[PDB]
Design a protein around this ligand. Structure first.
Ligand SMILES: [Ca+2]
Lengths: 517, 67, 240, 484, 484, 92, 39, 40, 38
RNA sequence: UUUU
């Protein structure tokens, strides 16, 4: 064992009294062996890449473990985000008995994405997912508009007994995608990513089991056109139900509009109950009864069903004529005289009602990422994946998942190339139900790492899941980067190890128990 | 076993320690580390317990201290 | 002599579940055993940085997380250096030709250990003596800046006739937006060291020039801009 | 005998290392443009060594004045096929306002026939700022659709490395710089293909003309996104025109408010949702007004009842765009969203650590050397990511981005650092000689000339490369010119 | 350490090396279809060996006329997931001229429900030209979300070996051939997804219907991109209607001028800035004039006020595109701009030095072994580059490209080199048998059948893989058939 | 400033916004007789450490604080003070 | 020759196993597999 | 023969030539080339 | 020469490393890093 | 008094 120190001046370099570089490659404390001498970062990384969560509390973590030891980057910033989320049933399913032996299903999709952690959707009833059930789900994640306003980890209904939420990574997510203040870095790599899905259940009714399995997915940049004078858009009205109030009376539709600018929707005529986004595009969260009517000044011209509907200075008024305990009829109304009203049939907790709109707004082009939603099937995973593991939640105090450089044999640098609006496709799934404009999740997807899911099944309303995640990303900062000030030399190539790792990983199942954490 | 993983990987890295990292050897070392081949007591498993008896036991004991 | 210490992830006696415990591990401390002390590089490094923030790096003394004042005060902390390098230039009157045997400028710098902001420039083309009026006109200015970020580009800015100033920020910290919609910063902070080298970028011969430098402390005693509702009084400025 | 790499490796190694010293040190030997990774059956390796003397914009390459005035010049080398780098400039010693840089970029994102710019000739995008595009000749030389029409399937930069000699008389060496490699990757934002009518837009960048009435006469660069190129020419007024070469419509012209040039529509055009002009109709362009910072332009269509256009454009600022719609058919082409390597001295120094700054006097210039900075191994950029270089940057809003196939049309070498060299406070009277020793390895699909010297790929020599790669991650890639 | 590699990793070796011979030499050991890069935690490796009997477009299969006449036939092999390869033939041994060339291309990109040529069967495309497609059964089988649907998250060809056995009676056992590998990466040119309306194009190719009065009849295959598959049936006249399995609208018909076909519009249509049909109109397409050379057609609908439509199409070459707008919606689905591997025996030599050529008499055909040429490692080729590729090539004018989701839609191996083999002096009395040992390895995401076969990705056999692409490298991907 | 009327001051929340290290000395460095043609490259080195909270895009770069080395610190302090904070731009 | 390539490999692969895997050895083997008979 | 950067190659390339060829070893040379060292 | 400060910073620091580090002992060092007792 |  010993420490190494490289010079600012390369053998012979003759710098002035203030020239050179401004950095000083932090010393090399590479440990020694009969055949290799990996640096604590190289080493720590190995363990971290292998048993992220464990290796840390295992004491084996150390040095620049958030950096990959394949001496590729001349300089790179890096770190780990260990966000810990507590997933737990969405419906406050009121029971009268002292023992509401209710159970619920829940599943998580992990995407080695820059800002995104993982996705999750549960079913209050332990019912499995139906095709159309599943589909709505999907088409929802594609239709999510101002997605950023969801990272709060908040639960969201999309189906009847189904809700779903998305969890970002505290900081990377804390890096905006607007031209003003925050823009990502030139690129990166998912240095290693693991998650423990602690089975937090009353050691009374610890029933339940879960299946985990890694599935690789590569995105497809099915890009959106850059429009000029006018732009095509989609008016979305996903009808839903008031988590508490009477279906046959009140509805809870989410109403957004693809390329139209975010404009405050205040309920004017009706009873009340709205919650508008803050995203760049126009979307709304509102619950109410029939008579009720929300309003807002249309930021820009809007066409529809051919004939123009609104103009910059117009005022759109959205209401709902009928509210069956499950279906919903609504109306959209323009100031602009000569325009006609818009109406459409939806079905709360079901697919969205689309309305090929057109917005008089210049439209920046941005790709949408066609990503195959990993086997979400109670038992599909179980089939297309042999390296999947599974035990009861009781035994495996939860699930431990370790992603890995799945797609590329080596560690490329997933950069801006595959960045954009996540839009998940799947079998049996119809895209016609896919919303237009730049909506859905938006992030740089580490095309190298293994995507992966884990469904929990047969657990208790009482049992909750603490998802301790350890995300290790490394990338190169460019400008305005609120991080560039942390980058140093990139890990040195100690492939010796690296390979080993790769073997293990390959040799291994990226799934384990929250007791092997 | 808290970090049974890194522990596992830890051992394999260990071997790599001396073993001249020949992808050929590395292979063996990997294969080995998992426990697939060439293993000895350099192996371990489920140390914890299913509450069934963990619970039941401490229930059996409370007063049965006569022994 | 060398040494490497490792603070266990647990505490003596703590029985810890697998899954849980501490999520962060402690980066190993490397100490340079000395006949009297054994600081960690994050110290020395610092030490040096703190002492000669540039020559310490040019030299090869900037070791480890030197951007952390070794005084066991914080449990957790964020350290980071910023090495922005702006080339403050003479301002522009016009392509108004320029003879070597002619024009030159006066330019001064004021550096404050301010978190985001780096330093404030100020120069006078025709080379001027800071007259009282000139001063005030200046100060009054810096103050009356509305969206101060507007010039964070480190771009020259006139105010007095033939007088221009500019603001240079810590490119990465300036980068961290304040009171924005969903944006905010750190809890506390403390300059761990800060130096600046105003390299004299001058022709080998027209090396003409003289500078003075000195450290003078300044502490901000705050005055408030009261909140309000129906209407908040304020004022509209218009400089020429 | 540990290993014996063939010259073509060594020569390579040394080059992908010190592409100047390699040659200079005669260390460059063998067919060195081929990366000894041994990945190709056959491959055409090549090394373009352009030596362009980037002189100050408003300067006489002839009787240079020993001015003593200054100027900023930033070079942003990109590992692109037939694109060496871009040169940013600034006669007046002024910083890069957001306004400024935002103007810059948009200019590069809306450069109609970027080919018309291959001359690397200077172009004023902002009052005191200019830009220009220097290319890797030989490649650029191979005419895109060509006459002998040589077409290269896929390639890969084997080594960029270029030195920016600080050509300056001891009298005036006042200068300092700083380089740094920042990796960049293109996200193919695709331009759709339409049928009878494909959308596009009309750009008009106005500015003053050199040695011309800064308020009486102004020059603009009028162009049209999917519009087939057509010839223009002053019809009535003070002369001043420069037609395009490209397949789309664009033109540079000088003149007063009285001056009027015109051309005949190559095809139907709608504007402001109105049939502006059809095939025949002869369109005219003039200036209702002309000042020193603004210009009212207005295009009159020969079409009957064809309402004309009127537009305000602050010369020196952006490009005032008029969405358009031409009756031509369009092939869907790819625009490439690309981050813009930190354009500011500080932006660079704080986010990039492996940068290296120097006083020109001491460091006889600058010498950057890129390297496979993305793929840990030399993949092979091909069709994979080729298109219209359309950049963004923090601050820049695409609100002012051209709807048409614009920008720098090339293939970005997926895996390879794109670098930036900023030269601050350089003597008006001084220039930057830029000798780049760029090399690439590619494959030929169709041609009549290139596929001749196409040979076998380099012999897979790990250790060599291995090391090469070590040294890179290891180095700065930015050195005193005195080190090339 | 012996450098002991899994007996299955060895299988892969020879397979990769000699995908055909390896089987014959019994050297085909273990699950040789998995790549020993020790990458995948798990995976499915498959290898289809589909055999195709290539007959001369006109010549029978039944009776073999010993014409002592010839025909040029070439094949282009792509490391596409289900697409085995494409083959084109000239019944006169003729050269591929530009137009012919471009027409050929043109066609491939405007192949509407390409699945309609899943059948090896030919398809005239030019005066004396035919072409067809060869799918890889088992994969092609993978119905893209139909009734029976399985899926793969990504894959990578583990090797491809095609051997075009020269099946020709020794009698006129004559002619020669040239094979060569050309690596090509595709670019994703996107076909924007739309809502209320979707732009498109109504293509209508035209060409003599073998066995019908040349000047009288004409076999034509007209389609309409976004327009949902419509069931066309002859309405009035001389028979000749072959419909499509396809998802969009396309049909191949033949007949007298006066012959009429008609179908109901499953969605509103627009043409020439005008409306054409409602989701219920009765569209009528027929021909006006039929020349052994040219052909005029025209379609109309029951739409009250629906103008008629008319254009011409010189029989045998190209399609009559019609900018159209459909009343249905499009998906993001993009095409894949793909360079077209030297189709002329010319360039192939002039571009690929590691190409080979022998006479079909001695070299019992031609055997080519595809190999990872793109990147130095076996990267995974997933979704990222999947789509209806439309080949581009010098000379080929994009103008001729359709507008909807056309062409062979499939995934392209972001690694393996594509290869083309041109046979020239073949005798019509000869048929080229095509043994195709092609084996990919991918991962499953959803399916009911494939999953059960996924095991572990082959262990990292670094040593072998090493030499593997080392050999393939220094080796011509082409070979004498008899050497398989 | 000594001789400045706070009358010229702008009302509302304008001026450069920011947190001030209520610890470090501020400095000033005036230059005169600098030929217009001469310029000044200001290579800075601002080190700093804080405690992140929420939304911080840096919390990741956070971890264990520096250990107490007043054993050394001391020197540094009494050292600085020992000398000016001003030196030659050829001694860095 | 019954898959010349095949055998041509067996030889190259044969040598391989029964000999160190020097990343540089290999080359000479792959090279011997056909042309330069390595010493 | 002015290349410093170049010298910094032939120096390591120099070693490599008679070096064990271990990629671990390569790291060694690759640092030596930069003229690094084991501090104390 | 470049790093003139870090020079004493070393002399100082270094010296410390051996001396009986003490406020007094220390001061003396900080003083030796430049001064002379006359 | 000790099992887990
Ligand atoms: Ca890639």
């Amino acid at each position: 064992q010993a420490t190494i120190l490289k010079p600012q001046l390369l053998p012979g370099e003759s710098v002035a009294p203030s020239g050179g570089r401004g950095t000083m490659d932090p010393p090399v404390h590479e440990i020694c062996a009969q055949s290799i001498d990996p640096s604590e970062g190289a080493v720590g990384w190995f363990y971290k890449y292998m048993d992220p969560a464990g290796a840390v509390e295992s004491g084996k973590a150390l040095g620049e473990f958030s950096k990959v030891p394949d001496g590729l980057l001349r300089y790179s910033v890096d770190a780990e985000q260990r966000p810990i989320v507590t997933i737990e049933c969405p419906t406050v399913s009121e029971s009268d008995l002292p023992l509401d032996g209710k159970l619920w299903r829940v599943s998580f999709i992990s995407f080695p994405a820059f800002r995104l952690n993982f996705i999750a959707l549960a079913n209050i009833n332990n019912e499995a997912l139906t095709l159309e059930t599943r589909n709505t789900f999907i088409q929802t994640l594609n239709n999510i508009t101002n997605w950023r306003d969801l990272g709060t980890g908040q639960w969201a209904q999309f189906a009847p007994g189904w809700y779903y939420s998305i969890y970002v990574l505290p900081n990377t997510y804390a890096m905006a995608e607007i031209g003003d203040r925050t823009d990502s870095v030139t690129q990166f790599r998912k240095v290693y990513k693991g998650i423990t899905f602690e089975f937090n259940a009353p050691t009374l009714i610890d029933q339940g089991w879960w299946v985990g399995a890694h599935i690789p997915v590569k995105p497809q940049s099915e890009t959106i056109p850059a429009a000029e004078r006018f732009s095509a858009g989609s008016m979305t009205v996903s009808a839903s139900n008031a988590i508490f109030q009477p279906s046959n009376t009140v509805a809870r539709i989410v109403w957004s509009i693809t390329p139209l600018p975010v404009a405050t929707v205040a309920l004017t005529t009706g009873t009340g109950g709205t919650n508008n986004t803050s995203g760049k595009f126009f979307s709304v969260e509102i619950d109410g009864n029939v008579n009720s009517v929300w309003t807002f000044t249309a930021p820009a011209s809007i066409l529809a069903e051919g004939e123009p509907f609104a103009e910059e200075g117009d005022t759109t008024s959205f209401s709902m004529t009928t509210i069956t305990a499950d279906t919903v009829v609504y109306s959209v109304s323009s100031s602009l005289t000569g325009s006609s009203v818009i109406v459409r049939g939806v079905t709360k907790g079901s697919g969205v009602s689309i309305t090929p709109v057109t917005v008089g707004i210049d439209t920046e082009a941005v790709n949408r990422l066609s990503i195959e939603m990993p086997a979400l099937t109670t038992e599909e995973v179980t089939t297309n994946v042999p390296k999947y593991e599974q035990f009861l939640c009781k035994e495996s105090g939860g699930a431990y998942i370790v992603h890995y450089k799945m797609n590329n044999p080596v560690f490329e640098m997933t950069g801006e190339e595959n960045f954009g609006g996540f839009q998940f496709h799947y079998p049996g799934y119809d895209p016609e139900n896919n919303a237009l404009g730049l909506r859905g999740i938006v992030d740089t997807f580490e095309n190298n790492f293994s995507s992966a899911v884990v469904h929990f099944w047969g657990i208790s309303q009482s049992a909750t899941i603490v998802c301790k995640t350890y995300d290790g990303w490394e990338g190169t900062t460019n400008a305005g980067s609120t991080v560039g000030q942390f980058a140093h030399t990139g890990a040195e190539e100690e492939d010796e190890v690296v390979q080993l790792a790769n073997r293990l990983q390959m040799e291994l199942t990226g799934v384990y128990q929250a007791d092997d954490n | 076993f808290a970090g049974t993983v890194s522990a596992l990987a830890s051992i394999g890295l260990g071997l790599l320690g001396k073993s001249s990292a020949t992808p050929s050897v590395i292979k063996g070392i990997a294969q080995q580390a998992v426990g697939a081949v060439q293993a000895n007591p350099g192996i371990l498993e489920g140390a914890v317990k299913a509450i069934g008896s963990v619970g039941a036991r401490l229930v059996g004991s409370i007063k049965a201290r006569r022994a | 002599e060398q040494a490497t210490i490792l603070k266990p992830q647990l505490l003596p006696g703590e029985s810890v579940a697998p899954s849980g415990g501490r999520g962060t591990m402690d980066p190993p401390v490397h100490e340079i055993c000395a006949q009297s002390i054994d600081p960690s590089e994050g110290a020395v490094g610092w030490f040096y940085k703190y002492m000669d923030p540039a020559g310490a790096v040019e030299s090869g003394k900037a070791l480890g997380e030197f951007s952390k004042v070794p005084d066991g005060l914080l449990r957790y902390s964020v350290d980071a250096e910023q090495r922005p390098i702006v080339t403050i230039e003479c301002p522009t009157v016009s392509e108004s030709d320029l003879p070597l045997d002619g024009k030159l400028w006066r330019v001064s710098f004021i550096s404050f250990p301010a978190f985001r902001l780096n330093f404030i420039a100020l120069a006078n083309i025709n080379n001027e003596a800071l007259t009282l009026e000139t001063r005030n006109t200046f100060i009054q200015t810096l103050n009356n800046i509305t969206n101060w970020r507007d010039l964070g580009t480190g771009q020259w800015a006139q105010f007095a006739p033939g007088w221009y100033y500019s603001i240079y920020v810590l490119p990465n910290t300036y980068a961290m937006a304040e009171i924005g919609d969903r944006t905010d910063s750190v809890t506390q902070f403390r300059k761990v060291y800060k130096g600046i080298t105003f390299e004299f970028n001058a022709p080998t011969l027209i090396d003409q020039g003289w500078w003075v430098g000195a450290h003078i402390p300044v502490k901000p005693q705050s005055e408030t801009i009261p909140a309000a509702e129906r209407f908040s009084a304020g004022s509209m400025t218009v400089s020429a």
